[PDB]
Amino acid sequence: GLTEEQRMMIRELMDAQMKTFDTTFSHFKNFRLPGVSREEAAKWSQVRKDLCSLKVSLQLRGEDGSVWNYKPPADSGGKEIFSLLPHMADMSTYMFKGIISFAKVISYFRDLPIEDQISLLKGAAFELCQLRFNTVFNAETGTWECGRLSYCLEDFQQLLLEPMLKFHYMLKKLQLHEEEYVLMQAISLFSPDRPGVLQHRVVDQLQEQFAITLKSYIECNRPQPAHRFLFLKIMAMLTELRSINAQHTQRLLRIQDIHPFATPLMQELFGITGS
Amino acid sequence: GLTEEQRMMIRELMDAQMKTFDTTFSHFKNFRLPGVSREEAAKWSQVRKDLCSLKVSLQLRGEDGSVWNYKPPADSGGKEIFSLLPHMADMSTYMFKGIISFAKVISYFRDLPIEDQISLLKGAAFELCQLRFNTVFNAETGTWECGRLSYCLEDFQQLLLEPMLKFHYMLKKLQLHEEEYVLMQAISLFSPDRPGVLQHRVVDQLQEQFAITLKSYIECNRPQPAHRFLFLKIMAMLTELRSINAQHTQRLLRIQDIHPFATPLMQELFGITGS
C-alpha cells in the first residue's frame, strides 16, 4: 500500500489544490470582452494560422438568469482575429495566479531557493493551467465549463488534429481522480530541466518521489484490467503536454510580436522585459 | 386622380422621410447594454405586469462578422426586470430625434407657431415612432430588424393579446406603401387635440387635407377588391394607435416613478421637469 510519507504527500497536494483552485471561477471578474513587406507578410500568415487553430464561442450566464453569447467573426484577412485575445489574456492571468498560489502553499516548493521557484513556475505554469482546465472540460459537448462562463469549440475529427485539443480529449478519456490530477501538476511543476534551474539534483529527487507516489496510488486503488499501464499513459501525456507547452510558447511570442496583448504577469512569466 | 397640391404634399412628406429616417440605423451608437409598504407594494405588482408585456431578446451583428446575443432574465421578483430599460431608452431617444427632425423639415409644421410645434410633437412623437418601427417589423419571425440590431419577441396567440403587439401584426398585414405610412405619420402628427394646442382651427384643416390626400391616393393606386375600405381600416388603426399611445404613457410614468430611466429628451417630451 501507500507509505505514510506518500499519504502525507497526496494530502498536502490535495490541500493546496482545495485552497487555490476556484472551480466555480467565482472570483474571476473585471475581465475584458469583445467589443460591439515580405517578412511581416509571412509573419501574419503564420499568426493567422496560429489563431484559427482554436476557435471558441463564449457564453455568460448572469446571476439574474440572463444569457450573453458571443459568436466570433470569420477570418476575413483583418484584425478581427484578435477580438478574443484581451479576454483570453485575462482568463490565463487569472489561472496563472491560481497556479502560483498552488506552488507557494506546497512545502516541497517553499523550501526550494527563490531563484528556482521562479524558474520552475515560468516553465510549468502553462502546463498546470491546462491540467486544471481539463477537469472542467466537457468532452461530450467540446466545452470548458468555467462557472458562469463557457468556452464551446466551433464546428469534427479534423479538430482532433490540433495537438492541444487532442490532449484534452485523450486525458479526459482516462477518467482520472482528483489525486491523480494534482500529482500530474506536481510532476510537471518539479521538472528539473526548466531553463534556469540550479538545485536540480534536489528537484529531480522531488519529481521522482511524486511519480513513485502516483504509480503506487494507481496500483493500490485501480485493480481493473482497463487501467493497466495507466501510469505509463499518464507519463506519456506529461511528455506530450511539455511538447504542447513549447508549441504554444512560440505561438504567443509570434502573436505578441505583431499584436501586443500579454498582461504584465504574462510578460513576467514569458520573460518579456517591457523594453 | 391626385390633384397637384396633393402630389406636392406627398412629395414633401416622402422627402422629409427620406432625409430623417435612418432605416439602417447606422448612426445609432454609444447605446447602453444589459450588464454582465402597501401602496408601493401594489406599485411594483403593476410595474412588473407592465414590463413583462413585451419581452424581447437582443442581437448585435458586428461589422467584423461577430454576433452578440442577449437572453433576458425570468421574472424572479427583483430588479432584474429593469435590465433592458437603459438600452430601450437610448433607442427611443434616437427615434425621437428622427421624428423631431421629420417634423421640422415639413413646411406645414414649420409655419405653425413654436408653442404648437412642441405641443404636437409631445403628443404624437411616440405614435410616429411606432409607425416607423412597423416598417422594419418582421411578422414572420416577430422581430424588429434595426440594421445590426434585432429585437425578437420571446415565446403564441396569447402574445397577440398585448395591444401594442396586436397593432404591429395587424398594420403589417395591410401591406402599405411608403407613401401611405408617411401619410399616417402626418395625420397623427397634426392631431388638433393634443394637450396645449392653440392654432387648432389651423391644425384641424391641415389634418383633414392629409386624410383626404391619403384617401385619394388609395383610390387612384389600389383598385383591387382586397383593398376595399382600406382607408377606413387605416383611420381605425390611427385611433387605436392613439389609445396605445395613452396606455404606454401611463406605463412609462409608473416605471419612472419607482425606477428612473428616462433620458433628458424623454423627460422633456413626457413633461418631467426634473424637480
Its sign, for the CA torsion A260, A135, A217, A243, is negative
Integer Cα distance of A248 and A270 in angstroms: 11
Residue A34 — left, alpha, or beta (φ > 0 → left; ψ -120 to 50 → alpha)? beta
> Do the Cβ atoms of B221 and B171 come closer than 8 Å?
no
> Do the Cβ atoms of A174 and A230 come closer than 8 Å?
yes
Integer Cα distance of B217 and B9 in angstroms: 11
Q: Which of A23, A250, A263 is nearest to A132 (CA)?
A: A23
Please give the single-letter amino acid code of residue A72.
P
Q: Which of A4, A124, A71 is nearest to A116 (CA)?
A: A124
- Provide the β-strand partners of residue B152: B57, B143
Q: Which residue of A has its CA nearest to B32?
A: A36
> Does residue B66 belong to the interface with chain A, where contact is any CB pair within 8 Å?
yes
Residue of B52, B58, B66 to mutate for A, most A C-beta atoms under 10 A: B66
What 3-state class would DSSP assign to A154?
A: coil
DSSP B54: S
Integer Cα distance of B273 and B275 in angstroms: 5
Integer Cα distance of A78 and A74 in angstroms: 10
> Does residue A30 belong to the interface with chain B, where contact is any CB pair within 8 Å?
no
What 3-state class would DSSP assign to B40?
A: helix
Exposure string of A9-21, with b = 16+ CB inside 10 Å and e = fewer, is bbebbeebbeebb
* B76 with A60: Cβ contact below 8 A: no
Output the CA–CA distances (angstroms, integers) from residue B121 to A60, B104, B125, B134, B261, in the order listed: 41, 10, 5, 19, 21
What 3-state class would DSSP assign to A27?
A: coil
- Rg value, chain A, Cα: 20
> Does residue A41 belong to the interface with chain B, where contact is any CB pair within 8 Å?
no
- Rg value, chain B, Cα: 20
Contacts by residues A122-126 (CB-CB < 8 Å, ≥ 24 positions apart): A122/A194, A122/A195, A122/A196, A122/A269, A122/A270, A122/A271, A123/A191, A123/A194, A123/A195, A123/A196, A123/A197, A124/A188, A124/A189, A124/A191, A124/A194, A124/A245, A125/A96, A125/A99, A125/A100, A125/A269, A126/A245, A126/A248, A126/A249
Nearest by CB: A66 against B60, B67, B83: B83
Contacts by residues B188-191 (CB-CB < 8 Å, ≥ 24 positions apart): B188/B124, B188/B127, B188/B128, B188/B131, B188/B238, B188/B241, B188/B242, B189/B103, B189/B109, B189/B120, B189/B121, B189/B124, B189/B128, B190/B108, B190/B109, B190/B120, B191/B120, B191/B123, B191/B124, B191/B242
* B65 with A83: Cβ contact below 8 A: no
Residue B135 CB: number of other CB atoms within 10 A?
Answer: 17
CB neighbour list of residue B108: distance below 8 Å, 6 or more residues apart? B190, B206
CB neighbour list of residue B230: distance below 8 Å, 6 or more residues apart? B174, B218, B222
> Does residue A60 belong to the interface with chain B, where contact is any CB pair within 8 Å?
yes
Integer Cα distance of B40 and B57 in angstroms: 29
Residue A64 C-alpha, separation from nearest chain B C-alpha, in angstroms: 6
Integer Cα distance of A190 and A174 in angstroms: 23
Residue A110 CB: number of other CB atoms within 10 A?
Answer: 11
- What cell does A230 get? 495507466
Residue A118 C-alpha, separation from nearest chain B C-alpha, in angstroms: 35
Q: Which residue of B has its CA nearest to A31?
A: B36
Integer Cα distance of A141 and A137 in angstroms: 9
> Does residue B64 belong to the interface with chain A, where contact is any CB pair within 8 Å?
yes
Residue A79 C-alpha, separation from nearest chain B C-alpha, in angstroms: 9
Q: Which of B51, B48, B53, B71 is nearest to B165 (CA)?
A: B53
DSSP A156: -
Q: Which residues on chain A are in Cβ contact (under 8 Å) with B73?
A: 62, 64-66
Nearest by CB: A73 against B35, B36, B62: B62
The resolution in angstroms reads 2.6
Integer Cα distance of B59 and A238 in angstroms: 43
Residue A47 C-alpha, separation from nearest chain B C-alpha, in angstroms: 18
Residue of A63, A67, A68, A90 to mutate for B, most B C-beta atoms under 10 A: A68
Q: Which residue of B has its CA nearest to A66?
A: B73
Integer Cα distance of A86 and A31 in angstroms: 8
> Do the Cβ atoms of A68 and B69 come closer than 8 Å?
yes
Residue located via cell numbers 494507481: A218
Tell me the backbone φ, ψ of residue B168, rounded to 5 degrees.
-65, -40
Residue of A64, A79, A85, A150 to mutate for B, most B C-beta atoms under 10 A: A64
- DSSP calls for A207-227: HHHHHHHHHHHHHHH---TTS
Tell me the backbone φ, ψ of residue A61, rounded to 5 degrees.
-85, 120
- What cell does B56 get? 424581447
Residue located via cell numbers 526550494: A112
Q: Which residues on chain B are in Cβ contact (under 8 Å) with A33?
A: 36
Angle (deg, nearest 10), helices A178-189 and A200-221: 160
- DSSP calls for A37-58: --HHHHHHHHHHHHHTTS-EEE
Tell me the backbone φ, ψ of residue A146, rounded to 5 degrees.
-110, 70
> Does residue A68 belong to the interface with chain B, where contact is any CB pair within 8 Å?
yes
For the domain bounded by B1-275, which CATH number is listed?
Answer: 1.10.565.10
> Does residue B74 belong to the interface with chain A, where contact is any CB pair within 8 Å?
yes
- What cell does B180 get? 401611405
Integer Cα distance of A102 and A98 in angstroms: 6
Query: What residue segments make up the domains of chain B, in order of their start?
Result: 1-275
Strands (E) across A36-142 are located at 56-61, 67-71, 137-138
Output the CA–CA distances (angstroms, integers) from residue B144 to A75, A211, B23, B141, B190, in the order listed: 29, 61, 12, 9, 26
Q: Which of B52, B58, B33 is nearest to B145 (CA)?
A: B58
Q: Which residue of A has its CA nearest to B66?
A: A73
> Does residue B72 belong to the interface with chain A, where contact is any CB pair within 8 Å?
yes
Integer Cα distance of A17 and A99 in angstroms: 9
Strands (E) across B8-72 are located at 56-61, 67-71
Please give the single-letter amino acid code of residue B229.
F
